[model samples]
Target: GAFAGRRAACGAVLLTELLERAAFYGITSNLVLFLNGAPFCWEGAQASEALLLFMGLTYLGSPFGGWLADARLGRARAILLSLALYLLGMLAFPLPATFAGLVLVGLGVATVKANITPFGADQVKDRGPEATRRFFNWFYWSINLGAILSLGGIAYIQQNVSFVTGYAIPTVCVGLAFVVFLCGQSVFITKPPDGSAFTDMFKILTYSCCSQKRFDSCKMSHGGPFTEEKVEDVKALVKIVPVFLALIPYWTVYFQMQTTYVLQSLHLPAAWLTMFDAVLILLLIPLKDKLVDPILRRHGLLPSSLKRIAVGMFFVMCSAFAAGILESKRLNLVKEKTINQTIGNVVYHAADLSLWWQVPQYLLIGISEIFASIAGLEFAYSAAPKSMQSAIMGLFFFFSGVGSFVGSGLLALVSIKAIGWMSSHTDFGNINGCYLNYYFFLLAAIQGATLLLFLIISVKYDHH
Candidate 1:
C-alpha cells in the first residue's frame, strides 16, 4: 500500500525530501555549538541571534521560491534549481565561518524549503481527502527519519571529529537527493505554472477593497472575471491567518529543542537526544492512524484538523511546564567546583545530572509535533485552492519565521534589567540571576491563553 502503482512518484519525492532534510538538519542540529567553537567564538546570546536570524530569514524567503514555482518555474524545475543552490551553499558552509556562511546557507534553505513539500504533495493523482492525509503523514514521517540520521550520525561526527568531515556527509546526501529526484523525472507528473493565479488573487483583493465589499457579503460578481471560485479561494486564503497566529506559540516552544534545551542539559550529546523525538514520531504515526483514528471514526467523532492542532498546543504547553520543573531541579544541582583556574583559561563548574531527565520534555514535544505540525501541514495544503498550494504552504512556513522573531524579541527582553531572567554576559551559558523556571512557565501560560483563543476560532473557521 505504501509503494504501489502511482504512489511510486510519491516514494521518489519522499526519498528526495528525506535526503535533503538529512543534509539540512545535519548542519543545523548543532549549529550553535559550531559557532561557539574556534575562530568565531560567539557568546550564547550572539550565537542565538545568529541562529534565530538564519531560521527566520530562511523561512521568510520561502514565499519568493514558492512564487517562482507557482508563477514561473513550476515545481520540478524549481526543486532542481533549489537543490543545486543548496549543494553550493553547503560547500561554502564551514568557510567565511560565521555570519557570511549563515547567510549563504539561509538563502539556499529558503528556496528548497518552500518548494519541496508542495512538490511532493503534487505527486499524488488520487486527489482524495484520505489520500492527501496519508501522503502528509508519510511525508512528515520521512522528515523525522532524515532528522534521526542527521542528528545521530552527522551530529556525532561533528561533535567528535572535524567540522569539515561532518559537513561533507550532508553535501554527499544532497548529491544523492539530486540523483533521486532526477530518477523520478519520467514518472513524475509536473504541474505547469499558471501565471493567472497570481493575477487573479491580486485582482480579487483590489476589486473587493475598491468596492468596499465585506468579505462574507461579497458573492460572485459579474462585473469582472472574478467568479465564485475566486471569491472562495480568497476566503480560504483569509481564513488561515488566525490559524497561523495560533501556531506561533507552538513553534516558539518547539524550536528551543536545539537552542535552550541543549544549553541547559548536562552530559548528553544534544543531537542524540534530539533523535529521540524522531523515534517517538515513527511509533506514534502508525498508532494514531491505525488504532486512534479508526476508533474515533467508529464513534463518528474523528477530530477535526483544528482540534488536533489545539491538542498539540496543549501538549507543547505541558512540555514547557516539564522543562521549567527540570530547569528548577538543574539549578539545585549547580555546584561551585573549582578546577584548574588560572589567568590564561577559566571555566565554570556544574554538577552532573542524569540526561534521562530531559526525556519527558522531548517525548511531549514529539507528541505535539505529530498532532500540530502534521495537521498544520495537511490543513495548509487542503485549505488552499489547487493553483495556490505552494503559496499557502510558504505562508504556513512564514509563521515559524515569525515565531523565531518573537523568540528573539523575548530573549532580548529577558536579558534586560527589568526581567533579569536571562544573562547579558558574553558567556551565554552563564545563567546567573536567570530564572529559566519562570521563563518556561511564562511561555506555558502564554501558550494556554493562545490555545483558548484557538479553540474559540477553530469552531467558526471554514475550510476549502
Candidate 2:
C-alpha cells in the first residue's frame, strides 16, 4: 500500500513525452520543405531562417519553463498547461495558418521540454538516483523511437501524401499525448513549487557586486540571504560557462544539418537526413557507453570529457570541410555540362553530382555528436553543483538556441544580394555569383578558430 504504484506514472509520463516529441519533430523536421514549396514558396535560405528561428524559440523558452515549474506552477500543472497549449497549437496546424501557429507551438513545446522529464522522475522517488539512470536511458530511447516515427514515417507522409494529412497525424499524436498525460493525473505526485535556480543565481550575482577591497580585513562576513555553500555552488555553475560558450560555435555547425544541409540535398526528402541524426545518436550513444569507452579505458586512452568535445569539434569542422568540397565539385560540374542528376525517383538539373556524397558529411556529424554533444552532457552534469544541474543543463539548451539564432542571422546576412554568397537561390544559377562553397568554407573556418578557443579553454578548465 505504501508503494502506491506511482512507478507506473513514469511509464505514463514517458509515453506522453514520446508522443509529444513525435508531434514536435513531425512538424519541425519537415517544416522547411513545407515552407519552401507550394503556397508559401519561400526561398530555401529564407525557409531555413524561419525554421531556425522556430527551433531557437523552442529551445530558448526552456529556462522560462524550468523556472515556472520550480517557482510558480508545480511541474504537473505546468505540464498540463503547456500540454494544453501544445495541443491547441497542433490543432491550429492542419488549418495551417502558418507562422502564428508555429509561434504558439514553439513556446508550448519549450515549457513541456523543460518540465516533463523531471516530472517523470518524481514518480520513482522510492527507487532512488540509480533509477534516474534507468529512467533517462529509457526516456532517451523513447525519444529516438518518437523521432523515428515523426522523421521517417511522418516526413515521408508529408512529402508523398497531402500536407494537410501529414500535419494532421502529428496533431493527432499531441491530442493523444494530452489524454494520456491527464490519465496519469491521479497517480502522479504533485510536488509544491519550490524556489527557482534562476532566482538563486540572480540573487547570488546581485550580492557579489563589491570587490574584496580590505585584503586581510575581508568584508566576507559570511553572507546575508546566501551562504558560503550557496555561493560556492553558484561558482561551480558559472565556472562551466567557458566550456558552454565555446560550444555555441559547435551548435551553430551542428544545426546547419537542418538548414543548409537539407537545402543542399536538392532532390532527397529534405528532413530525412536530419532523421538520421536520431538513429545514429541512438545507436552511437550505447556503442560508446557499452563498447567504445570501456575498450579505450583498458588502454588508458579514454579521452577527458573536454578532449572528447574537442575531437567532436574537429569532426563537425571536417563535416563542413566535406560539404565545401562537395559544393566545389558541384560548381565545377556546373561548368562542364548543365546535366541532370537523379536521386532515387527524382531528378534535378543543376549539377551531375550524387547526393550520396552527403553521406560522409552526415556520418561525420553523427560521430561528432557521440563525442561532443554526449560529452558536453557529461561535462555539464559533472561540473554543476547537484542543486544547479537542471539549471546548467537548461543553460546548455539555451546556448544551442543562441547558436541557432546566430546561424539564422548569418543566413540572413549572407543572403543579401550585395554579399553574392547565397543571395536568393534561383536553381543556383549565376554560379560565379552563388558562392555557396564559400559559405561552407566560412563555417569551416569559424570552427577552426573555435577549436583553438576550446583547446585554450580546455587547458584552463579545472574539472571536477
Candidate 3:
C-alpha cells in the first residue's frame, strides 16, 4: 500500500506496453502472408478482408471500453479482463484462422487500445505536467520500439520458420505480460468510475434537440450534469467529428500497406518493409524536433496543425501513386518470363522480383504518419475541452476502425467477378492480371478527393 503510485508503477506500465505491443505485432506482422500462403490458403483479397476485420473491430471497440471505464468498470479491472481476453485470443491461434478467435482478439485489443496509455500516464501525472509530458514522450517511443522488434524479428521467424512456432512466441509473451502486468496491481493508482463524456455529449445533443431555444441559451438544472462548459464541450465534438471523418480517406489508403504491400513482395518477407516504416518514424521524430522545428521557428513559417495534416494527406496520395507505378514496374518485369505449366489449355505466368522495390511507398507512408498522426493528436488534445480529451483519443481509433471497414468492404466489392479489380479465390496468384496498378491509382484518386475535402473543412475551421 505504501508503494502505491510510485515510479515503479510507471515502470511496470511501460514494460507491459512494450511486451504487449511486441506480442501483438508479432501475431499481426505477417498476418496477410500467413493467411495467403499457408494453412489458411485464402485469396489475396480475402486475407485483407480478415485483416481489416480484426483491425477494424479492435479500434471500433475502444469507445466502448472507454465508456465502460468511465461509467462502471474502472481502468484496472477492464485492463485485467482485457489482457485475459487477449490471451484467449492468442491462445486460439493454434487452431486454423478462426473467425471466433479473431473476434476475441479484436475485443481484447480494443480495451487495451483505449485504456493502457492513459493508465500508464496516470501514474506519473500527479508528479506534474512537466513530468507527465516526459512520460508520454517516452511512452510514444516505447510502442515503436516494440513494433520494430516484432516486425523485424517475429515476422522473420514466422515467414522462415513454422507458423506454429512463430505464433507461439506472441502467445507466451502475452501470457507472461499478463502475469507481469497483474503484479503492478498494488502500485497502480486505482481511479473510481465516474460518468462518461460520451454520455454527456449525447445528453447535451438530445437535450438540445428537444429544447426550443438555441443550445447556448439553454441551461440545465443547477448542480446537474450539463454545465456551460459541458455544452461547449459538445460543440468541440461537433466541430472535430468532421475533421475525423475527413481523415478516414487517409486511413483507407494507409491500411493497404498492411494488406497488399506484402502480397507484392514476391516471396520476400516483406514485413521487413513495415519494420522500416517504424524505424523511419523513430528517426524522423528527433530530426523534426531538433532541426525542422527550429528551422521553421527561425523563418517564422511554423505551420498550423491542420496544415501539417494537409501536407501529410498529400504525402499519402503521393505514396499511393508511387505504389501504382511500382506495381506497373513489377508487372512489366514479371511479364518478361511466363511459365506455361498449366493443365492442358490453360497457361499462367509467374516470375520473381525484389521486395525492396516497395520501399518508396513505405517511406512515403512512414513520413506522412509522423506529420498526420502526431499533429492530429496534438490538435485533438489542444482543441477539445479537458473533459472530452479522452473520448477524442478514442475517436482516432474509431476512425481507424472506419477506415478498416471501408477498405475491407471495398476489397470485397471490387473482388466480385463483375468488377474483377482483385484476385479470384482460386489462387494467391500474380495480381498483375487483375490490374492491381489501377487499384493503386484509385486509392490515390480517393485520397486526392479527401485531401480536397480536408482543405475545405480546415479552411473555415476555428478553435475553441
Local error of candidate 3 at 376, Å?
Answer: 2.0
Q: Which pairs clash in the backbone of model 3?
A: none
RMSD of 2: 5.0
Candidate 3 Cα lDDT to native: 0.71
- Candidate 3's residue-wise lDDT over 192-251, tens digit each? 334444455556666755552434433442335556775676666778888888888677
What lDDT does the true structure give each of the candidates? 0.73, 0.71, 0.71
The list of candidate 2 runs beyond 4 A from truth reads 1-14, 29-53, 95-103, 117-141, 155-163, 179-225, 297-304, 341-347, 415-433
Ranked by TM-score from best down, the candidates are: 1, 2, 3
- Cα displacement (Å) at residue 17, model 3: 2.1
lDDT, candidate 2, residue 5? 59
Candidate 3 runs further than 4 Å off: 1-12, 29-56, 88-103, 120-140, 152-166, 179-225, 267-270, 297-301, 332-334, 338-355, 415-426
Clashes of each: 0, 0, 0
Candidate 1 — which residues are off by over 4 angstroms? 1-3, 30-52, 94-104, 125-127, 155-163, 190-222, 256-258, 267-269, 330-352, 422-433, 462-464
The alpha-carbon root-mean-square deviation between model 3 and the true structure, to one decimal in Å, is: 5.7
TM-score of each: 0.85, 0.78, 0.76
